[PDB]
């Protein structure tokens, strides 16, 4: 019989993997959902999957399950312990992810990678070089979440449905991300026109918005009370676009080859996502100032990446 | 790279096939939706799928597409023209459908059949004989449509949400169909109690209800002004349960082997539908009176089937 | 209380398809269908029953009289002869203007105090007359405008660039038809101005836009198939607007809105991006279109006012 | 106007999870969250923003004061100490009765005249007190009852027989917890009495039922995972009921309804299949359960009344 199932494997069953799994189940995006428990090196944390509405068979397994899997979601990695340095955390999660990817490939997997573990841009690159798969088949969550927040906040300030707002947060989601105001529109109207022609908006309004999203990239507190809904939703959004061949434009972590003036790196940029992963990148002609900040962001990205990238 | 896509082929591009296709596109049930146009053996003679909200590639092709297709929907057949006898109409469509199934199988197809053509039960059986596939892989629409009307009508009479109503129309949808009141409940309450205990409903109320559905199986007219929405929705419902492996209970045309006291024929009975088609039939202990009417319906079914069933 | 009552006036093709789409999406709790003498009823009763039976939401549907408009939150005007392609047939306008005014008189006399949504054609004209006859605030009389054409506009652009329609943003402005304006200067794909695709990346030529715009215009009056009426066409577009209103969505829709200066024009209803919420049109988004587009827009409006002048009332209600 | 305003009192775990589900399903137009001194706030503000940001419907959310209850259509009571598995515990009931009365007193003082949905525990008792304190008709005070347990009930039955939950119809009756009654006599799978699967087809025995009912009973109080709160648990159940009301659904839900003779009991709110619409509980479907089940049901009610007697008001408002 000609079979019609989409198999997704979630490596890492901690807070993130758990949240992603629930969102997957809730949206019935995949028919087969396999959860691989990594260890005490996850996001900390069986029957908790039996409540799905639109029936999806979820079970626990091993890396062997990655053979026939279409997409594997990486969510493993630990949190920064008091004392440990940021660089030591990057190194830690870099060796965890690499090991996981090594085993995933061992099984014979030949699908698509969706990286959700942090630092996303770096782990996505390590995933790429470790799996040897084509760049377009290794997809990081990029600034999908930050962008969704960006749009909602703008929507809230101008009392409009977020769906009428189009814009992006570019780069690595953190203090270096770039609010691309030049290509942010509301009802088709450039946001800068709200400040440089209508004056219904001030310059400080944009900065406050960009900062709300900017330093929101670190607001979670005790983690046991957090829902991880944002990460679950954004990751599920990407999986869905891949599995349904949506050709959707998402600011996922994509490999650049000149677009935005950068190259040989994965980072948040508007990209068309389909059955085959990232088809191409949309290169927006952002302003010199935005390009400058984008440069700053990729520069810092590469510096940290150099501390863990493989030699071949 | 593992591919995640469901391919459905709709043979017959007349009113029915067109309506099913539109419901399919609208619900994004399949990703690849191929349309094989027969001839003047459909219902009224490419440029109309330019609205698919949820990206779905639709195109017209030959019986070739059936090779890698997962499910094929049969909708071809002509309507009774003035003068022609009912029997001659049955022979006409039996020959058409049979020729179609022969083609579809010659391409190397090995998926699942969903018969929407009328007479449904007969054609479902012919499809089974010609294709040579297992009975569980040939699925007729049975009394799915009638049952949905049946429940809505009951819901309207009692002022409740139809989702709270469970019951079925059994057999062949026509004047012989059987309204199984014995196993019809509202909010879990047997419909007979509203009559034989609360006296909030009388016998005539059921008969009128059963007759509205009964006389609805022949309540179509203009054709070009009809929407064929019911048929589109019914067929799409079945295709959806199959592709999504819902294990849903639908009164599709299933092959009986003793249940209900009948055998060797396909007729409307509540059945569990999954990715493999019909897994089993729920055999309800209907009352002697209901079983008697069912017998009558199956009896007439076989008499007409004998005039077209493949011999030896 | 939780009142979500919608009345549809006219049970012909347009009226019924709007009903099918409303039922399918379950936007209202109550859907009253009013059969008028100025419109011949179409579509079997069975197709109405199947819509309700297969509708995910349980909505109350029934045939009634104008009395139902008294406590209705929204009334949809659909009666009228179908406007066919070509130059504007003036008698068809006069016929529909007459039908529209009579119907609106009946509606107001029932004590209705909600919002009007006009789906009849010529839409812009009938919206203006509905406003004059009803005496209601302009923000509470909403025409379907260029909503349908804009949806088609984005879909075609999407197909051409092989991208998801949700990533395309742009609008068709003015009176939907041969004089409509494709605002290319404010159409983007994933944030990228459609014009860059031609004035830089050179992936599209000027002729690619023209072919696209014509595809949209050469269908602004096409009669939708009944087997598709539930999923596409005037029915869907009207339901989109009714939905934005009933859910206080604040959606940006190119409905027929009353202008008072934006786009360089005043005192007319025509297609322009507008924020639609529970009180109707809250405000109009005034895009800085190019002189060329604006000129094409001015012409569309001139054509509109010339025709409007033949049926406009001298005494408002 | 299209008024769909809901107020949630208490921003603790229960309150917030109900908010997440409400926002996710976009059931309400306006969602007000009231932080009271009787309940400690929990959950990040960021998680509220993501909920709204990823919610398909654009709902206006905001933290407010009791005065927001004046024009509210529905108020959800959620404040109270979590009831842990085991023997009731009178001090918890008394603490929450007190908390509930004070809150209900504040809500009525704002001029509220809508419907109350109680999701605090012990639900049946707090629903009875809410009815007493508010002075509203019993049909307008709705407890969440055994809805969650019923959903669980059907889900476990489905998994066991490898069928889709929607094909299963049945209910858990009475007070949800160790004394709830699984009404097997009126539980069907595709229309087939679950009992036949035992007393005929031998597809499973008496012990399969016991194992299944306990599974449901052994989680009737468990604290839901925050990462799942938006999709399952009290949040979803409460939202299901709120949805049935706002949409005048006429759904059959086992909410805490006021009995007046059905099931042989009177003057108490408890879990029973009830038709829920825009005016609250329209009527109770009185199932002809078996003497054995009714007996179990009688015991559950007796327990309820015994504990209710320790906190019931002597003067009805």
GROMACS .gro file of N, CA and C in nm, chain A residues 1-7 29 31 54-55 67-70 110-112 137 240 242-247 275-277, chain B residues 1-7 29 31 54-55 67-70 110-112 137 240 242-247 275-277:
model
  174
    1UNK      N    1   0.084  -0.123   0.000
    1UNK     CA    2   0.000   0.000   0.000
    1UNK      C    3   0.086   0.126   0.000
    2UNK      N    4   0.045   0.224  -0.080
    2UNK     CA    5   0.117   0.350  -0.088
    2UNK      C    6   0.089   0.429   0.041
    3UNK      N    7   0.190   0.441   0.128
    3UNK     CA    8   0.173   0.511   0.255
    3UNK      C    9   0.186   0.663   0.255
    4UNK      N   10   0.107   0.725   0.342
    4UNK     CA   11   0.098   0.870   0.354
    4UNK      C   12   0.133   0.930   0.491
    5UNK      N   13   0.241   0.885   0.554
    5UNK     CA   14   0.273   0.941   0.685
    5UNK      C   15   0.401   1.026   0.691
    6UNK      N   16   0.395   1.129   0.774
    6UNK     CA   17   0.506   1.220   0.795
    6UNK      C   18   0.564   1.186   0.933
    7UNK      N   19   0.690   1.144   0.935
    7UNK     CA   20   0.755   1.106   1.059
    7UNK      C   21   0.853   1.213   1.108
   29UNK      N   22   0.043   1.815   1.322
   29UNK     CA   23   0.125   1.845   1.206
   29UNK      C   24   0.184   1.719   1.147
   31UNK      N   25   0.206   1.270   1.175
   31UNK     CA   26   0.125   1.156   1.216
   31UNK      C   27   0.204   1.068   1.312
   54UNK      N   28  -0.679   1.534   1.746
   54UNK     CA   29  -0.675   1.483   1.609
   54UNK      C   30  -0.569   1.373   1.594
   55UNK      N   31  -0.588   1.267   1.672
   55UNK     CA   32  -0.502   1.148   1.678
   55UNK      C   33  -0.367   1.149   1.607
   67UNK      N   34   1.585   0.664   1.074
   67UNK     CA   35   1.605   0.616   0.937
   67UNK      C   36   1.496   0.667   0.844
   68UNK      N   37   1.373   0.624   0.872
   68UNK     CA   38   1.257   0.660   0.791
   68UNK      C   39   1.194   0.795   0.828
   69UNK      N   40   1.252   0.864   0.926
   69UNK     CA   41   1.200   0.994   0.968
   69UNK      C   42   1.223   1.099   0.860
   70UNK      N   43   1.126   1.188   0.841
   70UNK     CA   44   1.138   1.293   0.739
   70UNK      C   45   1.208   1.417   0.794
  110UNK      N   46   1.805   1.068   0.641
  110UNK     CA   47   1.832   1.143   0.519
  110UNK      C   48   1.723   1.248   0.497
  111UNK      N   49   1.669   1.300   0.607
  111UNK     CA   50   1.564   1.400   0.598
  111UNK      C   51   1.606   1.546   0.612
  112UNK      N   52   1.535   1.619   0.697
  112UNK     CA   53   1.563   1.760   0.720
  112UNK      C   54   1.581   1.791   0.867
  137UNK      N   55   1.898   2.197   0.400
  137UNK     CA   56   1.827   2.093   0.474
  137UNK      C   57   1.850   2.099   0.624
  240UNK      N   58   0.568   2.275   1.013
  240UNK     CA   59   0.445   2.276   0.935
  240UNK      C   60   0.467   2.327   0.792
  242UNK      N   61   0.735   2.313   0.625
  242UNK     CA   62   0.817   2.216   0.554
  242UNK      C   63   0.733   2.098   0.509
  243UNK      N   64   0.657   2.042   0.603
  243UNK     CA   65   0.573   1.926   0.577
  243UNK      C   66   0.455   1.951   0.484
  244UNK      N   67   0.403   2.073   0.482
  244UNK     CA   68   0.291   2.105   0.394
  244UNK      C   69   0.335   2.182   0.270
  245UNK      N   70   0.466   2.193   0.250
  245UNK     CA   71   0.521   2.262   0.135
  245UNK      C   72   0.455   2.399   0.113
  246UNK      N   73   0.443   2.475   0.221
  246UNK     CA   74   0.381   2.607   0.220
  246UNK      C   75   0.448   2.716   0.139
  247UNK      N   76   0.579   2.708   0.119
  247UNK     CA   77   0.650   2.813   0.046
  247UNK      C   78   0.633   2.942   0.127
  275UNK      N   79   0.899   2.185   0.116
  275UNK     CA   80   0.927   2.041   0.128
  275UNK      C   81   1.076   2.009   0.134
  276UNK      N   82   1.156   2.090   0.066
  276UNK     CA   83   1.299   2.066   0.059
  276UNK      C   84   1.382   2.149   0.157
  277UNK      N   85   1.314   2.223   0.244
  277UNK     CA   86   1.382   2.309   0.341
  277UNK      C   87   1.381   2.453   0.295
  313UNK      N   88   1.617   1.199   0.022
  313UNK     CA   89   1.536   1.279   0.118
  313UNK      C   90   1.392   1.228   0.124
  314UNK      N   91   1.351   1.183   0.243
  314UNK     CA   92   1.215   1.132   0.264
  314UNK      C   93   1.108   1.236   0.229
  315UNK      N   94   1.013   1.198   0.145
  315UNK     CA   95   0.907   1.289   0.104
  315UNK      C   96   0.772   1.272   0.175
  316UNK      N   97   0.719   1.386   0.219
  316UNK     CA   98   0.594   1.392   0.293
  316UNK      C   99   0.477   1.449   0.213
  317UNK      N  100   0.419   1.369   0.124
  317UNK     CA  101   0.306   1.419   0.046
  317UNK      C  102   0.203   1.312   0.010
  318UNK      N  103   0.077   1.353   0.014
  318UNK     CA  104  -0.034   1.265  -0.018
  318UNK      C  105  -0.087   1.301  -0.155
  319UNK      N  106  -0.098   1.200  -0.241
  319UNK     CA  107  -0.145   1.220  -0.376
  319UNK      C  108  -0.281   1.154  -0.398
  341UNK      N  109  -0.670   1.868   0.221
  341UNK     CA  110  -0.659   1.732   0.270
  341UNK      C  111  -0.541   1.661   0.205
  343UNK      N  112  -0.191   1.707  -0.081
  343UNK     CA  113  -0.099   1.808  -0.134
  343UNK      C  114  -0.103   1.806  -0.286
  366UNK      N  115  -0.467   2.717   0.106
  366UNK     CA  116  -0.358   2.637   0.160
  366UNK      C  117  -0.282   2.563   0.050
  367UNK      N  118  -0.195   2.635  -0.019
  367UNK     CA  119  -0.114   2.581  -0.128
  367UNK      C  120  -0.128   2.432  -0.154
  379UNK      N  121  -0.023   0.572  -1.073
  379UNK     CA  122   0.084   0.481  -1.033
  379UNK      C  123   0.135   0.510  -0.893
  380UNK      N  124   0.170   0.636  -0.866
  380UNK     CA  125   0.222   0.673  -0.735
  380UNK      C  126   0.118   0.740  -0.646
  381UNK      N  127  -0.007   0.743  -0.691
  381UNK     CA  128  -0.116   0.804  -0.614
  381UNK      C  129  -0.151   0.714  -0.496
  382UNK      N  130  -0.188   0.775  -0.384
  382UNK     CA  131  -0.224   0.699  -0.263
  382UNK      C  132  -0.370   0.656  -0.263
  422UNK      N  133  -0.171   0.112  -0.671
  422UNK     CA  134  -0.178   0.017  -0.560
  422UNK      C  135  -0.218   0.088  -0.431
  423UNK      N  136  -0.306   0.187  -0.444
  423UNK     CA  137  -0.349   0.262  -0.328
  423UNK      C  138  -0.485   0.221  -0.275
  424UNK      N  139  -0.573   0.319  -0.260
  424UNK     CA  140  -0.707   0.294  -0.209
  424UNK      C  141  -0.814   0.358  -0.296
  449UNK      N  142  -0.990  -0.204   0.080
  449UNK     CA  143  -0.922  -0.097   0.007
  449UNK      C  144  -1.011  -0.031  -0.100
  552UNK      N  145  -1.036   1.217   0.408
  552UNK     CA  146  -0.964   1.277   0.519
  552UNK      C  147  -0.936   1.176   0.630
  554UNK      N  148  -0.904   0.865   0.597
  554UNK     CA  149  -0.808   0.766   0.549
  554UNK      C  150  -0.665   0.819   0.552
  555UNK      N  151  -0.645   0.934   0.489
  555UNK     CA  152  -0.514   0.996   0.481
  555UNK      C  153  -0.459   1.036   0.617
  556UNK      N  154  -0.548   1.070   0.710
  556UNK     CA  155  -0.508   1.109   0.845
  556UNK      C  156  -0.516   0.993   0.944
  557UNK      N  157  -0.555   0.876   0.896
  557UNK     CA  158  -0.565   0.758   0.982
  557UNK      C  159  -0.644   0.787   1.111
  558UNK      N  160  -0.759   0.852   1.095
  558UNK     CA  161  -0.845   0.890   1.208
  558UNK      C  162  -0.910   0.777   1.286
  559UNK      N  163  -0.929   0.662   1.224
  559UNK     CA  164  -0.997   0.551   1.291
  559UNK      C  165  -1.136   0.602   1.328
  587UNK      N  166  -0.589   0.449   0.774
  587UNK     CA  167  -0.496   0.457   0.661
  587UNK      C  168  -0.497   0.333   0.571
  588UNK      N  169  -0.552   0.223   0.621
  588UNK     CA  170  -0.558   0.102   0.542
  588UNK      C  171  -0.696   0.085   0.484
  589UNK      N  172  -0.783   0.182   0.509
  589UNK     CA  173  -0.919   0.176   0.458
  589UNK      C  174  -1.015   0.134   0.567
   0.00000   0.00000   0.00000
